[PDB]
Amino acid sequence: CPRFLKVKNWETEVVLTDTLHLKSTLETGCTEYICMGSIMHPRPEDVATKDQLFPLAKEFIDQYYSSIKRFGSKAHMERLEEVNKEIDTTSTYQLKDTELIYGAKHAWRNASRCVGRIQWSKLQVFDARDCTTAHGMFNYICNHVKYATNKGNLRSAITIFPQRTDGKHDFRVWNSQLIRYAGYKQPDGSTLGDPANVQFTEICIQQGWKPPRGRFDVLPLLLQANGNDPELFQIPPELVLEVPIRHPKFEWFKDLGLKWYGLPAVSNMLLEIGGLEFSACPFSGWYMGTEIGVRDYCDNSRYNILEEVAKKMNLDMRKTSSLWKDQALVEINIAVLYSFQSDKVTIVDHHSATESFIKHMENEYRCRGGCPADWVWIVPPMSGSITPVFHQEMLNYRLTPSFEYQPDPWNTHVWK
Amino acid sequence: RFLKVKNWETEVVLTDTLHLKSTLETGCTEYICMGSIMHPSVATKDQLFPLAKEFIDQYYSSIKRFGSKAHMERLEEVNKEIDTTSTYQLKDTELIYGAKHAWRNASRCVGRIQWSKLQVFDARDCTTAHGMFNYICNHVKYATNKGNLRSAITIFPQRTDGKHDFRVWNSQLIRYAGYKQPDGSTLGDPANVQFTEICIQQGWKPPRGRFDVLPLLLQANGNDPELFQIPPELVLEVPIRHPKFEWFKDLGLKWYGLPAVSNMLLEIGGLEFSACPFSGWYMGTEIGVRDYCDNSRYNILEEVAKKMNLDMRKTSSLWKDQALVEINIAVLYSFQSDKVTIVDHHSATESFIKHMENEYRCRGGCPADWVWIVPPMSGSITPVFHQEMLNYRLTPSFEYQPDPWNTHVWK
Ligand code: HEM
Ligand code: HEM
Ligand SMILES: Cc1cc(N)nc2cc(-c3ccc4c(c3)CN(C)CCO4)ccc12
Ligand SMILES: Cc1cc(N)nc2cc(-c3ccc4c(c3)CN(C)CCO4)ccc12
Ligand SMILES: Cc1cc(N)nc2cc(-c3ccc4c(c3)CN(C)CCO4)ccc12
Ligand SMILES: Cc1cc(N)nc2cc(-c3ccc4c(c3)CN(C)CCO4)ccc12
Ligand SMILES: [Zn+2]
């Protein structure tokens, strides 16, 4: 590996120099002969053995004491010794509160696919490592939602449940986000509600949930403590801030009956710090408008929102070259942004977010020596080339602490 | 080993074995991916013969005559020719095969379902810039075809010692000049400001309009390049108007019909063709008229939004996005109305998915660069957005080469 790699911005001609990639610890999936940059992800018995844990913990503790300008100190050496004794005698170790907070913020700071990382150091960390039951998890999650929502002035936050021990006592949130709408596949094939959530909805109903069978039924929480079987809980509806979607010019848009929830809280990823694995760690921020997945709702039978909007706009839907899909996609995204701003719910448009990210990326190159960034996920899903990330070259690599994918729990769980 | 790629809308999984036959580096490593870097990075007798062999082998394998009589005879003939001349010459059949397969292997090209329909013009006998101009005129006339555009490539003599290169200095056969105004705005096409100044310094007398077709600057056998004017009756153009906004035509915009890329290098069996202009037809989003100045301060993007009376105070109004869609509607509407071949990004990406399926079935895979295949607008409502791809470098190939004015020893 060469010591300095350059990235160029082809609009501004600015060149940045990356050295931070020398600190990457996980494989990308690419090789010198093949690039897997567009692959989305390139057993339970296995937890870190003692001998695998030692070097990962040292690397994290070193990095932590380096960041607080205490590298090589008495404090640093005593912590190393203390961690090594814990691993020696218990096969694991416990993070200090300060290291837990540092590790969670840097897992976000290192998330190469996240365009909102300019915010990385303003993360509220909730330590739920004292949790023991699904009821306790529900309590912790309700407080998280209430704190993060903050009556529409959203605050990014993470709640960290106990780390993995032997792999048979994992804490898991089975939801993919804390707030999602149910989806119901009808006998004739059409979809009621959110088609993205049909499978998990079926699991909840299988587990005993009584579905209202509407378009916007907030799913229950499915929570697993200490490897036990997961248990169902209803989020108090007053904790779920929602926004009705309307359009600033099209009076008929509201008649589509659409709304969306304010808080994106992803809960099916894994947080890795110093070799420790926090398999339940829901984190939340606020939305970028393009993320809001209302366009895939069915309006009726075979017409989704995108098509219905085009019909109501009276666009020519016969030929594709009329760009009716593009026109309707813009109007939907205009409606989303206008509705959140009107109700004073935090949201960011893709122009502002990518513009902030470029400034963040420059600051990180200057102050940190690099900024891992996954162009394939950073560029927004519409109007790519008119955002400043499109012509920005990026280097992708995996730093630790990190957020990682993990198997869906229903595939791996051993039912009691 | 075998590698799988999933489409997350259709859940189709394809299995890639063809990447195993790749031997040029991508730029990535196990620890750093350079998928968004635009370019991450003469032949001796010893280097040449294995490359020539590999290509001859795959050629005779493709015509199902591997290990045949004529196959063995060709390897011996090529080997002897490298030994005595330090290079070798491709047969016409091989030249056509190689050119089509360089297109087939262009991982960044969404239009490759057409790869086998390519008219190849052998210009390896050319000796002078005048001859290059002749070959290029014939290429343009054939490819334009009164608006029924036909894909084509013209291939000039291969590199020898590196001091006698043939080069087309233009980036495309047809482009508009760009004039940086002391004002501060740009007259004409801002993307061509540098080459425009090189043409002026070379003696071109600029008309200083908005749509001045640049002269050809042609370099034969390493000599200094020479200027030529393409006959205007050969340059097919389309006035840009809008099917609903009658004021769009008042922006006075137009574009040329023939995209013909002339600054890339074609590599076949170890031989290097530094002058090989290739042309097809446009995808509507490629047409970079949005970056024109309408006045001394506002973009076509800004001018369109202004005439649509959009709110341009805040980005969240998405005025840029709205105007961008309307400019692309007009481009497509204008080419179709004038019966000039064009493809929209929905049809093109849809065709590319079908191309991938074909290629995985018959070839074992298809190298594809997601970063370049996804169109520059409305990405997620095209079928390629959710299509996983594998990117790898197969030869024959089209390659980047430095601008000739940074390497040329002037005399
Ligand atoms: C504060 C406002 C935030 C915004 C606007 C934002 C924006 C985004 C967007 C637009 C994506 C890609 C979405 C997609 O492709 O569908 C993303 C991905 C991601 N975000 Fe952020 N994010 C925010 C906060 C956070 C926080 C607080 C965390 C964690 C502490 C986080 C961690 C991640 C990760 C790990 C990914 C990649 C997920 C994956 O690989 O599957 N984000 N973010
Ligand atoms: C026939 C219709 C064709 C269409 C619609 C088409 C479309 C495109 C598009 C949209 C791009 C990317 C454009 C950009 O990023 O600005 C591209 C790239 C490319 N095209 Fe095609 N193309 C066509 C024909 C051809 C032909 C005939 C050749 C050569 C024989 C070719 C070779 C290439 C190459 C080499 C690239 C990548 C350039 C690079 O690596 O820098 N294309 N094509
Ligand atoms: C905190 C936060 C705020 C926000 N506005 N967007 C976010 C988007 C993601 C995200 C985006 C894509 C994605 C996944 C998560 C899940 N992985 C595991 C599957 C692949 O797809 C995560 C967190 C977000
Ligand atoms: C290559 C690539 C780049 C990028 N930026 N995002 C991607 C997102 C997905 C994705 C994954 C799961 C998913 C959906 C999208 C949404 N729909 C289709 C419902 C099913 O859930 C797949 C590939 C992506
Ligand atoms: C034949 C044909 C038809 C068509 N419709 N589009 C095309 C686009 C390209 C192309 C696209 C992008 C690009 C470059 C060329 C030049 N390289 C050297 C720098 C990187 O940028 C090439 C050929 C095309
Ligand atoms: C990462 C990436 C992906 C992609 N799909 N396309 C890209 C195109 C360029 C590009 C490079 C040079 C250039 C222009 C575009 C055109 N304008 C900006 C005039 C100046 O020349 C750079 C990066 C790209
Ligand atoms: Zn890569």
Author numbering:
A (entry chain A): 302 to 343, 349 to 722
B (entry chain B): 304 to 344, 353 to 722
Provide the publication's sentences verbatim.
Nitric oxide (NO) is an important signaling molecule critical in the cardiovascular, neuronal, and immune systems. The enzyme responsible for generating NO is nitric oxide synthase (NOS), a P450-like heme thiolate enzyme that oxidizes l-arginine to NO and L-citrulline. Humans and other mammals express three different NOS isoforms: endothelial NOS (eNOS), neuronal NOS (nNOS), and inducible NOS (iNOS). nNOS is an important therapeutic target since the overproduction of NO by nNOS in the brain is associated with a number of neurodegenerative diseases. Thus, nNOS is an attractive target for therapeutic intervention. In our efforts to develop inhibitors selective for neuronal nitric oxide synthase (nNOS) over endothelial nitric oxide synthase (eNOS), we found that nNOS can undergo conformational changes in response to inhibitor binding that does not readily occur in eNOS. Here, we used a combination of crystallography, mutagenesis, and computational methods to better understand the structural basis for these differences in NOS inhibitor binding.
Compound 4 is a typical example, as shown in Figure 8, where the inhibitor can bind both to the active site and to the BH4 site in hnNOS, triggering backbone changes, but only one inhibitor binds to the active site in heNOS and does not induce backbone changes. Indeed, in the various structures with two inhibitor molecules bound, the inhibitor bound in the active site contacts the inhibitor in the BH4 pocket. Inhibitor binding in the BH4 site often requires a significant conformational rearrangement near the dimer interface to provide room for the second inhibitor molecules. In addition, mutating the active site Glu to Gln in nNOS resulted in the same conformational change that results from two inhibitors binding. This suggests that when two inhibitors bind, the first one enters the active site and hydrogen bonds with the active site Glu, lowering the energetic barrier to the conformational change required to bind the second molecule that displaces BH4.
